[model samples]
Target chain A: VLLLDVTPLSLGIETMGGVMTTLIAKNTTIPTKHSQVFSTAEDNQSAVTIHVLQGERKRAADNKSLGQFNLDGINPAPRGMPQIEVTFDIDADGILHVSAKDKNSGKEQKITIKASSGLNEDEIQKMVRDAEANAEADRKFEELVQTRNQGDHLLHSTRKQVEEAGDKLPADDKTAIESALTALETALKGEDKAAIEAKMQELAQVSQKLMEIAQQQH
Target chain B: VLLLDVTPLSLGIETMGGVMTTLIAKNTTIPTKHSQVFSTAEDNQSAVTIHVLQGERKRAADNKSLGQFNLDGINPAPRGMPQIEVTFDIDADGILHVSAKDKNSGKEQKITIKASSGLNEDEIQKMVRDAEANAEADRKFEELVQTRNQGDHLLHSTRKQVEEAGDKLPADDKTAIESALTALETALKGEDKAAIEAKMQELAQVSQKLMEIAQQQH
Candidate 1:
């Protein structure tokens, strides 16, 4: 009668942008049920694919894929409009039953995933530790991507403004903007989040100086 | 991609005499599939109830029951005449899927069991050791029962023969037979297999002597 069973890894479905959004957390007791609502990624999407994964990584691809199923016949609507409720039910036997239902059209799809986590004594504890350690790394990786995108957007818009200024722009200011753009590009390739953001800030400031100088001539 | 997950306990179904018949044994690799054929226990039995269990015990009642379901609609003839194929499929996630099919009628019942042995580090190893140790005990216990049953059968037949002999049985021989019968009954109440069989043999010898005396008089 002593039931001490627990899930060793988090269980969740892949969301938009391939994010692993956890529905049931690791160490949760068995015979547990959790429900979460998801939506389509594009407007007028007729069907949504449910990609089931198990792990602690933030991205779906980084986690282990259990299996996948498709739930179609959704009333075509804009992205994030359809309410696709995904349910994860872990019975007393530690088996998982997953179902995705469109609340509007009543269309549904179900799948049974045998999640192994492939965990052992030393490795089981190791995974819990790894997940905790990788959580920080995952956060930094995501931030680095965001910062790179911001730097790229700024560089593209600043180059356009510089070209439009033509002879009116000071040669020195244009050179400074170009130098800062190169530094940001170099930082984007590295894994240092702080360095990337610093370079992005420098680029933004030099680009702002060019804009101010161009305005002065006008 | 190193997959090392395994079941911690034996998974099996209950047989006719409440015995746990293991299908997948402990420490077997994950993503394994096994099939076994079973049958009804009674004549003209149209349904067979499959009781899924998991543990190291020999009896079905001693082991933990994961779940149970009935597979009916069989073309029943006599006991053990129907062929019911039971299949257990365990996926990489350690989830169990069980199905029972009546080969003659094609009537089937399926169930998904989430098997969590609820095993921990120290206890996991302990269960394996305990199973090994208990295996010897289980065998002895079965042997003891068999010996006691034999003792009972011999005592019953000897008592009938002694009664039929009536006044023909000599007083000293009758006293010796009664004493041996009492000793055999006492031995059967205890768990000593050797002692039980010894008493059974002594009682058989005394009864044989009584039978020989009766023959000589005839």
Candidate 2:
């Protein structure tokens, strides 16, 4: 089966100055993960917050906020003494999930972010159903054309053979063949399937009669 | 809300020499529309099939089949005399729909090709739902941290003012102040919502008691 490949959407982390620092670029393949470390801003700071964003904008506010998770038990150390690690994991389907852990304490937390892409499940299912129905309609249309083409081919070939023979065919046989071809052509033009099928059967009968007449001549 | 923008998957058309000519590049903003005119292979050909594919491969067989539709009722003139128009439209959500029409006959057909991008609607929904749930959990976690921080701020300010005055407070007063600071520190170490909230409340109560004791010291 042929598979269509899509890339991961752009993703970034928010900085202290409200700036967005990109981690993963747009259209990158998924199941992609990246990690970054952050430090406390001041002495004896016991916690840190990791803000995740998904967009290409320079400012954090300009980008969409996935969510913020706090890293706890930082040992109440001075600024930059303890590091908080944040990880972002985007799956194959382009969904983002995040986890954060305090390096010293090993305490961790995770959260999944919402995706703001295409149609919901219900809408796609409805479209699939409509596509199936249209497929059926198209098949019927093709069948109709094939049936008409078969009848036309038979009528065309017989008419050409008779014309080539030149006045050798009986008057009754020629009239019957011409009339049947005309009726089949008319039925093929109309939209009524039943009428078309019935006319096709009549054309088949005429084809059999014409064959008999030719055999007798032989 | 941060929007997850997945780039449009790469798709192309077959050209002369059997090369797959790219009409749209990968990772570009979608809802893309493109058209190409096709000529009949033989004279008096009344119909032509437009095969659609998605990929950047060199051959049509190398790409994933989207669907095929017929442009029927051509003028039936000499070869290349009648032209059929094929159009491909991909919506913002990465769903592809195609249309073909015979210019001479004014007959047209449309089809929605199933997305072969591995990530179908239901799969995307599940991923989105999981992401949202994680986001909600993170939101609650952030709120807990914010509340604890507010409690910490109150205790820090009181401690600073008391130290500046250099007033020797009562044992009960000192114990209350110490307990408040400890509670604030404990809340900063909490990873779970319940633990964070409990610590915050304890810190708040101790902070109130310290305030009452300080009022008497003055």
Candidate 3:
């Protein structure tokens, strides 16, 4: 009788942005197949390196590297133009086979994993815990970045409107907009999400007042 | 000025037989692309799991798992017939984008790794050492298996020849062949390669004599 096995942790590879992307999630039943699609990161690139990794880390370098190989002979093209497809197939033996192909040229390469090194049960457990902690941190950082982007966008549009309102602007509203813009920019530079949001709200209100006043005059 | 970084260790994924295959070797310049090809293991299997791994051990389970995902929507077909390709693309940002595709059906799936948990410098160093040690052990074990197979093959051939010569040989030669066969069989069961080889040589000499005697009689 054959006993079924499940993956104890996530399995994946490094992507174009230093992120650890999972291909086979942990605890999934064995003997499964999964695939993903990718594109060239640079123009006229001739080759790509496939770096297979294993871990729960968000960063590729931080995770453990199993091994790597290259798939060459790519046609010269613009960045993100070539459609390269990769597949990962695992059979009952728990072996993994990875393959890649360029849809345009049909050029392909493949690798069969033979290395035997890996993490232990205890190590995997620790990694699971670390991943949970990291997810929270990642969410927080993502939120901060979004807030900063929002603030920057608001500041840009307000400045444009104020410039268009040249000479027709109310001095009091103009002064208020400038103050709010400065505060938001400063907050964007810092790591305080709440401060950035608060400043963005203030700028939006002043910009609204400016727009209303301009509408009344016109 | 931008700083260029290289991979500190090899990267790879698991294969059908629990092997770890390297896609990116250690010390490769970052922001590279590599790919590989794979086939379905079972008849009518529609899915595959891409288990990304890291480290230098010969077995996939011994390596560190990064994460995993699936590429579904496959057209049912015989095993070892479908072409599944997988790619690992790492960009300047150090993020990993893994993709897979089924060449026949043009079906695909992809994943972007964002998990953040990993090993430190010291841990990676230890892994490299362990890999070296494992390579030696693997070589030794492989050699032993080969030797055992050779011995088994010799025994099977010799037994068939003796059976064909039944009652054609003198009692003395037949008795000699039987004793040597027993000795060789016992050695084949043991772990000593040298002993098995020695026993095989002894059996060969007796078989040679029997063949010579039979030829003279004919």
Candidate 4:
């Protein structure tokens, strides 16, 4: 009755020390595929075993282990030197299809997704409420991060330009650029989101003037 | 740490009445994205509702309902005219980010994949065995289907040539071709894998000779 596409939590693989190393992640498009090349962790290692998991947790054990498979037929080699290609493919009508192939021997095994997610409707609804509430806030936060980055980059180039002009340029121009840089660095550290934003905005004007001075000298 | 990409089961939206129409498949690579455009099914429909789900079942109810979101704010118009675009974006390190935008109004709701699979190890392991066991059988069956199709195509063309000739051809030649066609049709059915294959082999030779005759007359 409804057409919807969603990611069920997050999907990741167990990396060294049981960390969740994400692959396709939670809400990727289905009927799509991705892969990673893995290696044996030790000398003469013939088998590589790692668990596939689903969930949005930092630790591998915190996530649900979908299953584990072996990347077999590895050549007897030292640590971190073999290439075992693991691919994850999802079709339009079925679960996950996982395959592991050895680069040297061409031995392959496939493990498919044979199930659904852990959350019930009640849980997902709760998530929906939280995400909807966060959506606007998240978008605004993202803009701040972008603006802050742009300000930082512009200031960095402006500082380099003023310094490159050397002692021959007017001293106040260099001091003005330095003062903005110091103020920006301090603003970057503060907790007030608005303060950081306003500082970045102010810095933008100063950086533009410094850029012009540098451009004129050239 | 390993960098991996994977799809969580299959990503599908319920279309019409409880049918699972997939947008993305399980075990797909991570950090992937895709979208589909859907229309309101009725005239003057004001809103569209869909539940995003994850699972392998053809039935939408059988899968995990990730969440429900409204594709609202459509321009008031006739049914099936307004377009609502839903996008699924899975980043390399986070959850699914889904957004729906009305083509006319640009009103959108952000929904996202927010979950794992249903089958246990025993089921999945049994599947692995079945796949390993059936791999050979499946390949052989595929080849038979391919060969049977090829023979049928060749026969169709030969029949076309013979029919175009009408009375210009000798009677015995036409009779021979008819006999081979009948035999080929018979061979198309019944299991005795080797026997069907054998008949197909026999028909191939006869069909070839008959084709030569048809071409010669032309």
- lDDT of all predictions: 0.76, 0.61, 0.66, 0.64
Model 2 docking tier (incorrect/acceptable/medium/high): incorrect
- What tens digits encode model 3's per-residue C-alpha lDDT throughout B38-122? 6565545779988887677766677678778888866554344345668777677766667887755667888765423234578
Q: By the DockQ metric, which is better: model 1 or model 2? A: 2
What DockQ, on C-alphas, does every prediction get?
0.02, 0.05, 0.01, 0.01
Better of 2 and 3 by DockQ: 2
For each candidate in turn, the TM-score is 0.36, 0.42, 0.35, 0.31
- Model 4: residue A207 alpha-carbon error in angstroms: 45
List the candidate 1 regions with Cα displacement exceeding 4 Å: A1-3, A115-123, A142-218, B1-218
Clashes of each: 7, 6, 112, 28
Winner on lDDT (1 vs 3) = 1
Candidate 3 stretches greater than 4 Å from native: A1-3, A140-218, B1-218
Candidate order (TM-score): 2, 1, 3, 4
lDDT of 3 by residue, A66-184 (tens): 77778887665434434566777777887878888765566788878753545777888888888777764654554465456556655654564475467777788899889988888
TM-score pick, better of 1 and 2? 2
How would you class the docking of model 1? Answer: incorrect
Worst 10 residues of 2 chain A by lDDT: A1-10
Q: What is the TM-score of chain B alone in each candidate?
A: 0.61, 0.47, 0.61, 0.52
